[PDB]
Copies of this chain bind each other. A is one copy, B any other.
Amino acid sequence: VGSEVSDKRTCVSLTTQRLPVSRIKTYTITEGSLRAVIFITKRGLKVCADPQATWVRDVV
């Protein structure tokens, strides 16, 4: 972070009013050929974008 603009895969952490969690959750959302990964942290929301890397299914 700290202003990073990638054209490949960018991840961002945002720090908000957060409650602590023991372990980090990973949530995956597929959208066409885009993979959006959410990492749930005690500090906030950390998101990663993995677009068109591999061949992805158009939601199934």
Contacts and interface: CB of A to CB of B under 8 A. Distances in A.
A6 B10 contact: no
- Copy count, this protein chain: 2
Contacts of A14: 5-6, 10-12, 47, 49
Given A5-B14, A19-B33, 10 more contacts: A7-B16, A8-B16, A8-B17, A10-B14, A16-B34, A17-B52, A18-B52, A44-B49, A45-B47, A45-B49
Contacts of A10: 14-16, 44-45
Contact of A38 (B15, B25, B38, B52): B38
A7 B16 CA distance: 4
A55 interface: no
